[PDB]
Amino acid sequence: GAMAMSGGLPELGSKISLISKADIRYEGRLYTVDPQECTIALSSVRSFGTEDRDTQFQIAPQSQIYDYILFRGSDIKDIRVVNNHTLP
16 A cells, blocks of 8 residues: 555445446445456445336335345446545
């Protein structure tokens, strides 16, 4: 770690929010990433709901958390890291 701060390398364990092509919102901890495989894997992640594109029948929310979900860049269209800091 020659530099005190980094930008290209994402901090391990950071909480990231991820939007999949079904207009579904998933959130989980960054576990591992593969730049050349265009693929990523998140650990401890939960989904908030599908109600936007959902079916016209009622769907029950999922309370159970997923230990690990693998995701390809092709199926998910946008990812953003959340920044939590304080001000003077």
